[PDB]
Write an enzyme that holds these catalytic residues in place. Structure first.
Site, mmCIF file in Angstrom:
data_model
loop_
_atom_site.group_PDB
_atom_site.id
_atom_site.type_symbol
_atom_site.label_atom_id
_atom_site.label_comp_id
_atom_site.label_asym_id
_atom_site.label_seq_id
_atom_site.Cartn_x
_atom_site.Cartn_y
_atom_site.Cartn_z
ATOM 1 C CG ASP A 1 -2.270 0.623 0.977
ATOM 2 O OD1 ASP A 1 -2.234 1.829 0.696
ATOM 3 O OD2 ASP A 1 -3.336 -0.017 1.100
ATOM 4 C CG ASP B 1 -3.172 -0.720 18.893
ATOM 5 O OD1 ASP B 1 -2.706 -1.117 19.985
ATOM 6 O OD2 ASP B 1 -4.343 -0.964 18.539
ATOM 7 C CG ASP C 1 11.744 4.019 7.265
ATOM 8 O OD1 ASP C 1 10.566 3.678 7.501
ATOM 9 O OD2 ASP C 1 12.337 4.917 7.916
ATOM 10 C CG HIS D 1 -5.842 2.464 2.478
ATOM 11 N ND1 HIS D 1 -5.608 1.153 2.109
ATOM 12 C CD2 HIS D 1 -7.182 2.574 2.649
ATOM 13 C CE1 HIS D 1 -6.760 0.512 2.045
ATOM 14 N NE2 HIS D 1 -7.730 1.352 2.352
ATOM 15 C CG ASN E 1 -2.052 -1.821 23.059
ATOM 16 O OD1 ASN E 1 -3.258 -1.914 22.800
ATOM 17 N ND2 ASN E 1 -1.188 -1.251 22.228
ATOM 18 C CB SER F 1 -6.587 -2.775 -0.245
ATOM 19 O OG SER F 1 -6.714 -3.582 0.901
ATOM 20 C CG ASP G 1 -3.710 -2.914 -17.157
ATOM 21 O OD1 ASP G 1 -3.066 -3.864 -17.662
ATOM 22 O OD2 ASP G 1 -3.234 -1.762 -17.001
ATOM 23 C CG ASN H 1 -12.931 0.009 -3.170
ATOM 24 O OD1 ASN H 1 -13.482 -0.797 -2.442
ATOM 25 N ND2 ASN H 1 -11.748 0.501 -2.899
ATOM 26 C CB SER I 1 -9.596 -0.869 -0.170
ATOM 27 O OG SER I 1 -10.665 0.086 -0.185
HETATM 28 C C1 LIG Z 1 -10.750 4.435 -8.381
HETATM 29 O O1 LIG Z 1 -9.491 4.434 -7.673
HETATM 30 C C2 LIG Z 1 -8.702 3.387 -7.936
HETATM 31 O O2 LIG Z 1 -9.007 2.505 -8.680
HETATM 32 C C3 LIG Z 1 -7.416 3.462 -7.166
HETATM 33 C C4 LIG Z 1 -6.190 2.780 -7.797
HETATM 34 C C5 LIG Z 1 -5.006 2.766 -6.832
HETATM 35 C C6 LIG Z 1 -3.835 2.013 -7.458
HETATM 36 N N1 LIG Z 1 -3.408 2.709 -8.720
HETATM 37 C C7 LIG Z 1 -2.092 2.194 -9.256
HETATM 38 C C8 LIG Z 1 -2.038 0.710 -9.508
HETATM 39 C C9 LIG Z 1 -2.181 0.211 -10.796
HETATM 40 C C10 LIG Z 1 -2.057 -1.149 -11.060
HETATM 41 C C11 LIG Z 1 -2.173 -1.672 -12.465
HETATM 42 N N2 LIG Z 1 -0.842 -1.938 -13.117
HETATM 43 C C12 LIG Z 1 -1.017 -2.626 -14.438
HETATM 44 C C13 LIG Z 1 0.337 -2.941 -15.060
HETATM 45 C C14 LIG Z 1 1.161 -1.675 -15.257
HETATM 46 C C15 LIG Z 1 2.532 -1.984 -15.875
HETATM 47 C C16 LIG Z 1 2.509 -2.341 -17.335
HETATM 48 O O3 LIG Z 1 1.556 -2.229 -18.060
HETATM 49 O O4 LIG Z 1 3.692 -2.807 -17.735
HETATM 50 C C17 LIG Z 1 3.792 -3.180 -19.138
HETATM 51 C C18 LIG Z 1 1.305 -0.973 -13.908
HETATM 52 C C19 LIG Z 1 -0.057 -0.677 -13.286
HETATM 53 C C20 LIG Z 1 -1.791 -2.013 -10.009
HETATM 54 C C21 LIG Z 1 -1.638 -1.546 -8.704
HETATM 55 C C22 LIG Z 1 -1.272 -2.476 -7.617
HETATM 56 C C23 LIG Z 1 -0.407 -3.539 -7.870
HETATM 57 C C24 LIG Z 1 0.011 -4.343 -6.836
HETATM 58 CL CL1 LIG Z 1 1.077 -5.678 -7.185
HETATM 59 C C25 LIG Z 1 -0.404 -4.139 -5.530
HETATM 60 C C26 LIG Z 1 -1.264 -3.080 -5.301
HETATM 61 CL CL2 LIG Z 1 -1.803 -2.776 -3.674
HETATM 62 C C27 LIG Z 1 -1.702 -2.254 -6.309
HETATM 63 C C28 LIG Z 1 -1.771 -0.177 -8.474
HETATM 64 C C29 LIG Z 1 -4.531 2.691 -9.711
HETATM 65 C C30 LIG Z 1 -5.759 3.415 -9.123
HETATM 66 CA CA LIG Z 2 11.403 5.348 2.827
HETATM 67 CA CA LIG Z 3 -4.709 -2.154 20.800
HETATM 68 NA NA NA Z 4 -9.420 -2.087 -7.206
#
Ligand SMILES: COC(=O)CC1CCN(Cc2cc(CN3CCC(CC(=O)OC)CC3)cc(-c3cc(Cl)cc(Cl)c3)c2)CC1
Ligand SMILES: [Ca+2]
Ligand SMILES: [Ca+2]
Ligand code: NA
Ligand SMILES: *[C@@H]1O[C@H](CO)[C@@H](O)[C@H](O)[C@H]1NC(C)=O
Ligand SMILES: [Ca+2]
Ligand SMILES: [Cl-]
Ligand code: NA
Ligand code: NA
Ligand code: NA
Length: 471
Positions: free
Chosen positions: A44, A53, A72, A85, A99, A144, A155, A186, A259
């Protein structure tokens, strides 16, 4: 057993309830399971590691900052508290118990870290380095978020991230496989359909949706066939929300959305892994299928599948039940090695027009080492052109008669780009025998004279050929 004394534990209704509208977590605590020895990481915007906590359970070995390339994951503090978040999610899993601060985590003796990955440009490499963080130390990853929940995006993980998923489930956790827990999305108000999110649609992620306190499908929920199960989260303004740790060493009662559901599932999975550390990534999905509870979750699409389990596209197999998870984990027999049966179906491209049905009778690799009589996940990998993608609805019917929605109409999806070998996944035929007739339905839900062609339909079956329970 003595329940937590934390000041906001009574407000954690999804744990502390006595009205049966909870995750049955006290029952697991009373069996002795609290997450001791389990390591969870929140992917995140960072984690406030000095939160009063979280500090007692904080694990630097579960943490990294892939946005600024350092160890970090401390959040970037801003006037709007944008990067709070991950701290909220960390507390859901593993906030310290007894605690005098805020509430408790589901797995309040687990170790907790975070990957700071969302506070910056998210690239394929960023994703891969996050999913692949310390995979023989971290047991469970909680994510999330994914591609934009705008109801018009298709995607998923690009090459490095997909490679990280296969390395994780194959060699992670000493060969038992990283457990990736995902929020299904969401995008409800945008009429999003979550098989269009390749992270939650992956077989390698254990995908989780939400239920409101009163047992309803929240406004933000996405329905899809790839979801496995449900945890409580927020709803309307008469319904309570998630209570957890918040940025700046505070405590929130207003954590929301799907999320907020994935971290609670990650906590329940942490309790389950304490009960049996030998569980594989597939074992964990089996436990969720077998123990999750439909009761009192309201949806108009509850259907009984071929092995007698109720399934919904909003809820999967239902609410997670922590007491049942840890009980069934203890003597669980490891599932057989995963088989994969590939069935390329079309002999020629097929015009879609207003409606297309493709029927194919399969033997599910009879006579081969990949013969499957006990399905886990199934995919219909489709390649098709269409003039307006969101007018399509797609269904897949198993031999046992289970109708999986692979794609619902998405009114905002104006794309003319179709689907390029998109692996729509369903969990709804889990434990069915996949031999027999499968039916693919593609329909134009609009009155427009839309047009296109299906050029490839590959049915991919995963599963085994032994160890079934009586339906
Ligand atoms: C309505 O508000 C929302 O929808 C809020 C969202 C918050 C997250 N934003 C960025 C995002 C985008 C992607 C998709 N990804 C596809 C592939 C691409 C690279 C490529 O095409 O290379 C050829 C890079 C982007 C994924 C992850 C992701 C991934 C992991 Cl592994 C963990 C987590 Cl937690 C999140 C996060 C998007 C908006
Ligand atoms: Ca850092
Ligand atoms: Ca506690
Ligand atoms: Na999502
Ligand atoms: C874990 O499961 C595998 C496969 O059944 C088995 O070979 C191994 O002995 C088990 N290990 C423990 C510690 O139970
Ligand atoms: Ca989505
Ligand atoms: Cl594969
Ligand atoms: Na998934
Ligand atoms: Na049925
Ligand atoms: Na059959």
């Amino acid at each position: 057993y003595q329940e937590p004394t934390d000041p906001k534990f009574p407000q954690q209704w999804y744990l502390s309830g006595v009205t049966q509208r909870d995750l049955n977590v006290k029952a697991a605590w009373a069996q002795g399971y609290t997450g001791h020895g389990i390591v969870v990481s929140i992917l995140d915007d960072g984690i406030e590691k000095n939160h009063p906590d979280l500090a007692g359970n904080y694990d630097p070995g579960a943490s990294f900052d892939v946005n600024d390339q350092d160890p970090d994951p401390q959040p970037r503090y801003t006037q709007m508290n944008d990067n709070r978040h991950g701290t909220r999610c960390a507390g859901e899993v593993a906030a310290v118990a007894n605690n005098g601060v805020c509430g408790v985590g589901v797995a309040y003796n687990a170790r907790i870290g975070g990957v700071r990955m969302l506070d910056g440009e998210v690239t394929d490499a960023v994703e891969a380095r996050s999913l692949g963080l310390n995979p023989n130390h971290i047991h469970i990853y909680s994510a999330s978020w994914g591609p934009e929940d705008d109801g018009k995006t298709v995607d998923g993980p690009a090459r490095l991230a997909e490679e990280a998923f296969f390395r994780g489930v194959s060699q992670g956790r000493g060969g038992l496989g990283s457990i990736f827990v995902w929020a299904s999305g969401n995008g409800g108000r945008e009429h999003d359909s979550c098989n269009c999110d390749g992270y939650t649609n992956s077989i390698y992620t254990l995908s989780i949706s939400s239920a409101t306190q009163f047992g309803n499908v929240p406004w933000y929920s996405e329905a899809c066939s790839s979801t496995l199960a449900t945890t409580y989260s927020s709803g309307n303004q008469n319904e309570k929300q998630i209570v957890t740790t918040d940025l700046r060493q505070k405590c929130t009662e207003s954590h929301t959305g799907t999320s907020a559901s994935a971290p609670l599932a990650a906590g329940i999975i942490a309790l389950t892994l304490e009960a049996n550390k030998n569980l594989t990534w597939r074992d964990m999905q089996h436990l969720v299928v077998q123990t999750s509870k439909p009761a009192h979750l309201n949806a108009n699409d509850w259907a009984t599948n071929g092995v007698g389990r109720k399934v919904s596209h909003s809820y999967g197999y239902g609410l997670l039940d922590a007491g049942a998870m840890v009980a069934l984990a203890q003597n669980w027999t490891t599932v057989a090695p995963q088989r994969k049966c590939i069935i390329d179906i079309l002999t020629e491209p097929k015009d879609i027009g207003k409606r297309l049905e493709v029927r194919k009778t399969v033997t599910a690799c009879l006579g081969e080492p990949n013969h499957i009589t006990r399905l886990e996940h199934a995919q219909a990998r489709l390649t098709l052109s269409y003039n307006r993608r969101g007018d399509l609805a797609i269904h897949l019917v198993s031999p046992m008669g289970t109708r999986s929605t692979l794609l619902a109409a998405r009114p905002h999806d104006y794309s003319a780009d179709g689907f390029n070998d998109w692996a729509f996944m369903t969990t709804h035929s889990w434990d069915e025998d996949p031999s027999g007739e499968w039916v693919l339905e593609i329909e134009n839900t609009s009155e427009a004279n839309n047009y296109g062609t299906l050029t490839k339909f590959t049915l991919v079956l995963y599963g085994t050929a032994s160890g079934s329970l009586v339906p």
